[PDB]
Structures are given as structure tokens and as C-alpha cells.
């Protein structure tokens, strides 16, 4: 069931959202995974996915009843069900750093999480049952 | 100037701007851009004249969207509009200041220049043939 939970539709509402944002110098603050501390690809997605949930709630806010706003709602609802595909190991700031980048650099991070997560669930529905207490400990 | 400017700016433009604004993510960030200072330039007409010019720099340089997106074309259209509006403004970095405000605050300023410009042209399409040399000179 986890396999095809993330549909192409979610990816396209993300892309549209990414394509709608203005290209400026603007830089914002947000917590996200540190690639240099967390090398393991699978564990990276496990943690990123959780930090994304906060990012969609706290940072990614759009005027109510707009395509992008509703797009975010969808993703959040989807995520609540995706959680069951991820066995808990979290919400502890291990392997985490503060970022200062553009909203576009951010949204790209979020898009890649959903993308890679989708590709890997379609292929190995059981992939995220892996124990990442080891990787999380070595950060 | 002619009656060619009486209804140059239609609601379609203002409504594409609001849509362009509503689609942006609400952020705390602040960006840099050069705009008019209401204090240095007190004259409402001459204020809109210069703001209109600066908006041209802002559309091209600051308000950039990915090619082939509804917003990029909305900007292209607003630039096609401005090209035509130039026949309504008679030729004359004075009265200019650098603003450090959020992107949405900027887009709101742009909207107000087309919004307040639209209202006056409908009433007096020959309004921007005004000589604003004297007002631009008294700016510090």
C-alpha cells in the first residue's frame, strides 16, 4: 500500500508551486538535514521527511484558498498516512543544522524528498523499515 | 498625449498582479530594490511618473519568474502594457531611495502604481504630460 501512496499529482502540484515562486535574492531560515553528517541515503530521507512536515506547517504558508495553499494541505494530508510507511527510530535535532537559503533552494529540498521517497516506495515498499539509530547516532 | 491612454490599464492587469501576489509564499525575508520616496517627492503626479519608470527596472531586474509560467507571461504582458504607456508619459537618480522590504510588500507597491495610475488616466488621460523637472530638482 505504501508503494503508490505518493502520486505524480503531488509532484506536479509541487513543481507548479516551485514554478510560481518569484526569483529573488530573498533568503529564509529553516531546519533541515545535514548531508555532511548524514551520508546514508535511506536514513537521510527518513529524517528529511519528518523535518519536511514542520517546513510545510511552519514555513511554507500561502494565502488561504489559493492553488498553492490547497496544494500544501494535500501534501500534509498525504504525509499523515505516509508516516506509517516510516518506522520510528526522531524530532531530535541529530544530524540537523540551520539553513539560510532562498525559498527556491528550500522547496527543491522538499521536492527531492517526495521524489526520491516516491521512487523508492514504488520499487521497495519496505525500504523505510530500516533502523537508522546507527546513522542518527554517528551525527 | 492622446485619448489612447484613457483606458490603457484594464482590470485584467490588476487582477493578474493580485494573482501573481497571492501565489507567492509569505516570507520574513527582505530584498533590495530602488523606488520613489513619498517624502522627497511630495507631488502626487510627479510621484507616479517616476515610480512608473522605476517599476520598469523592477519588472525586468527584480520580478523574474521561470520561463513559460503564468507569472512570467503576466510580467511580459505588464511590460507590453508599459511600452504603450510610455506614449502617455512625457520625457523629463533623483528622488530615489533603496528599499529593504519583503517581496510581497514590493509587489504591493507595483500594484498600487498601476492601480493609482489607472484611476487617474480614466479621468484625465492627458495628466502625465506634466513637466516634473521642478519637482525632481527639489529632492535631496
Name the pair of protein chains with the most residues at their interface, and give those residue counts: A-B, 19 and 22 residues
Shape by Cα distribution of chain A: globular
Number of strands of chain A: 2
Task: Give the terminus-to-terminus CA distance of chain A.
Answer: 32 Å
Number of helices of chain A: 5
Strand percent estimate of chain A: 5-15%
Oligomer: homodimer
| Estimated structural class of chain A | mainly alpha
The radius of gyration over CA of chain A amounts to 15 Å
Strand order of the largest sheet of chain A: 1-2
Mind describing the biggest β-sheet of chain A?
2 strands, antiparallel
Disulfide bonds (chain B): 5-88, 46-132, 95-139
Protein name (chain B): Macrophage colony-stimulating factor 1 43 kDa subunit
Organism (chain B): Homo sapiens (Human)
Glycosylation sites (chain B): 115, 133
Write structural notes for this entry.
The PDB classes it as cytokine. The entry lists the keywords rtkiii, cytokine. It forms a dimeric assembly. Two copies of one chain form a homodimer. The first copy, chain A, has a two-stranded antiparallel ribbon. Chain A is mainly alpha-helical and 139 residues long. Chain A has five helices and two strands. The first copy, chain A, has a single domain (1-139), classed as Up-down Bundle (Growth Hormone, Chain: A). The first copy, chain A, has helices at residues 8-20, 41-58, 67-82, 103-123, 133-137, and strands spanning 28-33, 96-101. Helix content of chain A is 53%, strand content 9%. Chain A binds chain B through residues 19-29, 60-63, 66-68, 103, and chain B through 22-32, 62-66, 69-71, 102-103, 107.
